[PDB]
Design an enzyme around this catalytic site. Sequence first.
Site, PDB file in Angstrom:
ATOM      1  N   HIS A  47       0.727  -1.243  -0.052  1.00 19.47           N
ATOM      2  CA  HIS A  47      -0.163   0.044  -0.058  1.00 19.47           C
ATOM      3  C   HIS A  47       0.848   1.505   0.008  1.00 19.47           C
ATOM      4  O   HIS A  47       0.254   2.525   0.123  1.00 19.47           O
ATOM      5  CB  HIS A  47      -1.091  -0.123   1.038  1.00 19.47           C
ATOM      6  CG  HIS A  47      -0.619   0.258   2.270  1.00 19.47           C
ATOM      7  ND1 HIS A  47      -0.342  -0.642   3.293  1.00 19.47           N
ATOM      8  CD2 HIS A  47      -0.096   1.439   2.953  1.00 19.47           C
ATOM      9  CE1 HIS A  47      -0.072  -0.271   4.506  1.00 19.47           C
ATOM     10  NE2 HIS A  47       0.098   1.120   4.404  1.00 19.47           N
TER      11      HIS A  47
ATOM     12  N   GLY B 192       2.410   6.332   9.218  1.00 18.93           N
ATOM     13  CA  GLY B 192       3.878   6.195   8.788  1.00 18.93           C
ATOM     14  C   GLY B 192       4.736   5.100   9.304  1.00 18.93           C
ATOM     15  O   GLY B 192       5.633   4.890   8.945  1.00 18.93           O
TER      16      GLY B 192
ATOM     17  N   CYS C 218       3.849   1.806   9.073  1.00 19.62           N
ATOM     18  CA  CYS C 218       3.750   0.694   8.338  1.00 19.62           C
ATOM     19  C   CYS C 218       4.906   0.419   7.646  1.00 19.62           C
ATOM     20  O   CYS C 218       5.807   1.388   7.418  1.00 19.62           O
ATOM     21  CB  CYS C 218       2.620   0.754   7.386  1.00 19.62           C
ATOM     22  SG  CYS C 218       0.760   0.821   7.913  1.00 19.62           S
TER      23      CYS C 218
HETATM   24  C1  LIG Z   1      -0.337   1.973   7.524  1.00 17.32           C
HETATM   25  O1  LIG Z   1       0.318   2.654   6.420  1.00 17.32           O
HETATM   26  C2  LIG Z   1      -0.158   2.812   8.763  1.00 17.32           C
HETATM   27  O2  LIG Z   1       1.153   3.137   9.026  1.00 17.32           O
HETATM   28  N1  LIG Z   1      -1.046   3.003   9.277  1.00 17.32           N
HETATM   29  C3  LIG Z   1      -1.101   3.630  10.591  1.00 17.32           C
HETATM   30  C4  LIG Z   1      -1.550   2.771  11.924  1.00 17.32           C
HETATM   31  O3  LIG Z   1      -1.578   3.265  13.204  1.00 17.32           O
HETATM   32  O4  LIG Z   1      -1.355   1.600  11.859  1.00 17.32           O
HETATM   33  C5  LIG Z   1      -2.327   2.331   8.642  1.00 17.32           C
HETATM   34  C6  LIG Z   1      -3.503   2.275   9.218  1.00 17.32           C
HETATM   35  C7  LIG Z   1      -4.356   1.710   8.102  1.00 17.32           C
HETATM   36  C8  LIG Z   1      -4.073   1.168   6.928  1.00 17.32           C
HETATM   37  C9  LIG Z   1      -4.987   0.569   6.045  1.00 17.32           C
HETATM   38  C10 LIG Z   1      -4.550  -0.861   5.328  1.00 17.32           C
HETATM   39  C11 LIG Z   1      -2.886   1.399   6.930  1.00 17.32           C
HETATM   40  C12 LIG Z   1      -1.624   2.175   7.548  1.00 17.32           C
END
Ligand SMILES: *[C@]1(O)C(=O)N(CC(=O)O)c2ccc(CC)cc21
Lengths: 304, 304
Positions: free
Chosen positions: B41, B143, B145
């Site tokens: 993603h 951020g 992820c």
């Molecule tokens: C991912 O890119 C990310 O950093 N976060 C934030 C978190 O707090 O985990 C997140 C939240 C939702 C999604 C949807 C797949 C991706 C991410």
Amino acid sequence: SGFRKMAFPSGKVEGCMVQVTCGTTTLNGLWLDDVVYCPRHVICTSEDMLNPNYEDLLIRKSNHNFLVQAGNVQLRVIGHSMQNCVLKLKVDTANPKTPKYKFVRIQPGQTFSVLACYNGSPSGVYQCAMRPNFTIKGSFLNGSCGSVGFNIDYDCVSFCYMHHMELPTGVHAGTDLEGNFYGPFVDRQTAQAAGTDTTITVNVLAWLYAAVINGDRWFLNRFTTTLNDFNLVAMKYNYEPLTQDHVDILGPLSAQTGIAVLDMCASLKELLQNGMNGRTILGSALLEDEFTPFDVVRQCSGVT
Amino acid sequence: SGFRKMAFPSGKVEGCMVQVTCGTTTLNGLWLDDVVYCPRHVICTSEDMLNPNYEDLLIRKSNHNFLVQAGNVQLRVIGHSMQNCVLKLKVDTANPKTPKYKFVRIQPGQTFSVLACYNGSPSGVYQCAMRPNFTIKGSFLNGSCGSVGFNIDYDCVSFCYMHHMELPTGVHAGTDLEGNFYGPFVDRQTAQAAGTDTTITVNVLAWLYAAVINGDRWFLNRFTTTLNDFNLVAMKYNYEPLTQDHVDILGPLSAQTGIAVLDMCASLKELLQNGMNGRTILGSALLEDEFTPFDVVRQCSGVT
Ligand SMILES: *[C@]1(O)C(=O)N(CC(=O)O)c2ccc(CC)cc21
Ligand SMILES: *[C@]1(O)C(=O)N(CC(=O)O)c2ccc(CC)cc21
């Protein structure tokens, strides 16, 4: 979202850990530039520990009696000195992995990470706090002495603790990196008892702010209090007295949440008087006091 | 003495963290040999996240659209592929700090350390467990992820988790390093609910053995039970069923303490039925389930 007991990344400190052996005793050392810092009781046998005279025991030691090993390579000891309860071993090689560093003496209530080591090798990292009675509740086995505590501000490691002792009650004692013990403890195998381990009030409040920021809000009450009224209840529950300095330090958390510091104090007062009633806050059934207000801001903002 | 929630030393993993940017999205990547692994993603905008078709979105991306930065230096991307929910970015330089490593898919109940990162920089390390519903309760901000979970066996890092998502309830979901999600979760901003978060029974028992080894013995009762009788009570309290495999795994802790596994089960059964009564075990007011039997042995023996 989510709030965890988090330690600083330990890489910068792992690159500093060495093994120090004097005769038949082996513990950990901290190699920064061309000096290795370690507990002075590396010179003691288990018998010497009962009543050591370190100056006298040190007369029988020369540079070549301290064996310092970094990884699987031996460092050449070219000088040694005792500073308070630590030995400083001058070596002929500066540690190539020496990070930017400072030596700090922390106040009670301050948190730090510990990199527990055995034979100069890191086994794990955990977060703890300097208790108000100047002990820490760590996880330390035989040979863990010399393991250090530290905080990091971007790229600078501030070393604040070196492990030296376990009291007969299982709690831990140690020094700053100048060799001065926190609290009244001495590096001797003699019965030494700790004072009252009070709860770090300002840290509990900071953690209650973290709970609000992460959605655990059930404990928020409809009351406020004053510092004097709050402190009467805090004294009764063995909580540290809250000062206006503590209120000032919680200001950014009060601003972020819109909950006045004294309103959070009144919520804490009700939690102390009513208990948790089988409920949890941030997955804990007790009020957590090993997060400072700076830790809560750092974790909730993502400081790297 | 003392027992702490301890993470593995993070140095070996800090040396692998990089920043990956695709267009306007930035997350963390894991650089091992000449490949950078990151959540697929990274190619999405916040709008794409609502209903992404990753294969279609990837057609619009070339090697030069993935900006990988290690420290403050840019890595040259010479290939890219999608494997399940991760992107593998082939770079022209092998990571000089690549540790010995394996990719492992862990089972629910297994614990691991997470090195939380932002913009490819480590902010902290904490220990957690893969819940029985295949979520983790981490501490992750925007951020984060691409931050990874891992275990270490002496010098080999076994990567078991990469962070990809936060569910609307604040719990976390992610994949193994082959890009396969743990549990039924998908990398899409759509309401996804977690199943029952049961307590990891074998881990609670291991932690009760750690408490006995560290002197907290008040909860030891005068009873025994059977696996079937214990499991009837465990089901009622949303505890995972205990199997003979779990009993086998607790064997070394049973041998060290002289407390039969089924006697510890009966003590746990009484704790569930009577509660803690305002008491604590290893400084906790609830029964801790994020220590495996291997974690208790490792910490109580000092494995480095
Ligand atoms: C991912 O890119 C990310 O950093 N976060 C934030 C978190 O707090 O985990 C997140 C939240 C939702 C999604 C949807 C797949 C991706 C991410
Ligand atoms: C110190 O050398 C050490 O490793 N330990 C073991 C511990 O569990 O902390 C210890 C215990 C007592 C003393 C007396 C000063 C020294 C040490």
